[PDB]
């Protein structure tokens, strides 16, 4: 994928945002911004230019599933890739995420190799 691809990393835990941003740096993606919940995320996305979202599942104000649904219903962002991150895999959340249009779902903490693999599989099915 274009290494200038602009990511938005969404998590209420500033520490995890830092970690994910650094994992992306380790993969050659330097163009990354952060958001602290689903509402903040939408405010940042409105500026345009974003090509990928990585979002935590449980957040106050607007959670990850609601963010995903809002993204998917939007004209401009309808096809914006969204990778959902969760502290623990729950079969019901996986289904809900998939049927709501999630591009993928990963359990944290994850290694750089795992993130790379998730992103690459998403890039490959979307032709990025
Ligand atoms: Mg959280």
């Amino acid at each position: 994928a274009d290494k200038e691809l602009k990511f938005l990393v969404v998590d209420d835990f500033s520490t995890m945002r830092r970690i994910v941003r650094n994992l992306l740096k380790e993969l050659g993606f330097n163009n990354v911004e952060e958001a602290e919940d689903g509402v903040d995320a939408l405010n940042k996305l409105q500026a345009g230019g974003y090509g990928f979202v990585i979002s935590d599942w449980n957040m106050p104000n607007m959670d990850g599933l609601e963010l995903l649904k809002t993204i998917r219903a939007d004209g401009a962002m309808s096809a914006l890739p969204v990778l959902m991150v969760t502290a623990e895999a729950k079969k019901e959340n996986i289904i809900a995420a998939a049927q709501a249009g999630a591009s993928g779902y990963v359990v944290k903490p994850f290694t750089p190799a795992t993130l790379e693999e998730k992103l690459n599989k998403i890039f490959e099915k979307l032709g990025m």
Side-chain angles (χ1 to χ4, degrees), residues 11-13 56 58-59 108:
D11 198 316
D12 56 308
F13 193 24
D56 187 40
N58 286 333
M59 301 180 289
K108 56 177 169 181

Side-chain angles (χ1 to χ4, degrees), residues 71 73-80:
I71 290 174
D74 180 72
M77 303 189 292
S78 69
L80 189 55

Side-chain angles (χ1 to χ4, degrees), residues 102-116:
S103 301
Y105 180 104
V106 68
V107 173
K108 56 177 169 181
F110 47 80
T111 59
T114 291
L115 179 59
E116 188 171 352

Side-chain angles (χ1 to χ4, degrees), residues 19-20 27 72 77 89 91 120 128:
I19 292 171
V20 177
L27 295 184
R72 286 285 171 265
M77 303 189 292
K91 52 189 161 187
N120 285 340
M128 298 168 66

